[PDB]
Design a protein around this ligand. Structure first.
Ligand SMILES: [Ca+2]
Ligand SMILES: [Ca+2]
Ligand SMILES: [Ca+2]
Ligand SMILES: [Ca+2]
Ligand SMILES: [Ca+2]
Ligand SMILES: [Ca+2]
Ligand SMILES: [Ca+2]
Length: 112
RNA sequence: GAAGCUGACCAGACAGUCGCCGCUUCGUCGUCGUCCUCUUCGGGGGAGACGGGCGGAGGGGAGGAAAGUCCGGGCUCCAUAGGGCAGGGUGCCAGGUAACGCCUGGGGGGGAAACCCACGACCAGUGCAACAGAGAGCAAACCGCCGAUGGCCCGCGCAAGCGGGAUCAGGUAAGGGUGAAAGGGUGCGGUAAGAGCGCACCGCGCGGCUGGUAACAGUCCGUGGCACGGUAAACUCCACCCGGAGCAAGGCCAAAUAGGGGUUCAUAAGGUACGGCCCGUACUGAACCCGGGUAGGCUGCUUGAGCCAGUGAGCGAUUGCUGGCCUAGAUGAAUGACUGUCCACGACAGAACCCGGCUUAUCGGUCAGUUUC
């Protein structure tokens, strides 16, 4: 299966703080990923995109929609991490293809 | 058939699989902590709630601006002798509406480029221009004013007929005159070259009078020979109205240490609400010592001062009847990919308790009007 259940989301601020204490890190000039190993036996993810880097609400929502997808469509191929994903200033004009071509070569860095 | 502009609908459609979030409903599970029947005390359809209780199945899910921080209103909690003061708003006339700083029709501004109106007071001081004397109306008559208008000047012969003087700005005032900006026109022996200065006909006042719902309007009847220019997005007055906060408002069900004193003020203090500020006016209340909880869930929540259709009333804004009708509500916070046709080859952009306006953003269509090729 390739569902994306509530159980797979970092729902609370403490869960963000934990991965920031000990992150393994990968990122481009525009987009970046942090993660720590976890005991739950499957991956998890949490999103934050700064209103400072990406203005107007139709944008940001696009970056959520596309990045939530590229996680669940790869769910079984990376270790049982807890992950955080954050947008730098330079993302807000990349087309849907231009995020998706990057997130693959970004996850190709996670040789752990 | 040649350019805009106003109004309309719209700014994408359908099919495949891979998913996200609620709705409805069927059995599934716990539980009975309702009890129908009350039993076998299982809990049976359980009478009944709720949780993945759990699996189906059906049927749904971003605006005309959802943007803004701007005006009006609901709802809820809180505050409230109020007599002043302070501080914001709104200022032709009628109507609409639940209310507005919104809408409609009229009046007056221009009712055209007024296809546009911050449409009460112009005096209570002050600033007209920068520059005037044109600075509020101030007054250099600018060429006159000598115009013999006066004096008196003196030269004409005593001059009395002729020139000058400007005398005293010189009947001016703004007759007339360049210089800016200007307190009535245009005429008439306007008389010394002259003016409401007299006298026509117009202004313009102020009072009648006829229209109007009323702003207002009419040479329609008297009129003063007549008496603020302009400007309050100018400081001024004048009239009327103005109490906080936010859906994590608020409940309800929970969950809990409320423990010498206090700031021994007494007495009442001075604390704080009235209240920005004073005047009362109310309440009395102890700078904390002797302080932990809750940090949850349910509800408020999507039915709207709504929509549609048929028929009355109205110049319009709107609105009276009589039939119907309704699956965004999330809570790290709910919409991707492949394909083949539209070109409009797809702009600006998004919900957060809800309803009425206004403002701002916006590739481009296709219609209907309406001024133009
Ligand atoms: Ca649309
Ligand atoms: Ca808003
Ligand atoms: Ca509260
Ligand atoms: Ca709610
Ligand atoms: Ca919130
Ligand atoms: Ca509305
Ligand atoms: Ca509204």
């Amino acid at each position: 299966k390739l569902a994306f259940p509530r159980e797979l989301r970092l729902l609370t601020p403490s869960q963000f703080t934990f991965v920031f204490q000990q992150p393994q890190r990968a990122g481009t000039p525009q987009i970046t990923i942090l993660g720590r190993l976890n005991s739950l036996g499957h991956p998890r993810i949490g999103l934050t995109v700064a209103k400072k880097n990406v203005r107007r609400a139709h944008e940001r929502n696009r970056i959520k929609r596309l990045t939530r997808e590229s996680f669940r469509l790869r769910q079984h191929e990376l270790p049982a991490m807890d992950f955080v994903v954050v947008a730098k200033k330079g993302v807000a004009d990349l087309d849907n293809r231009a995020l998706s071509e990057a997130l693959e070569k970004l996850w190709r860095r996670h040789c752990r």
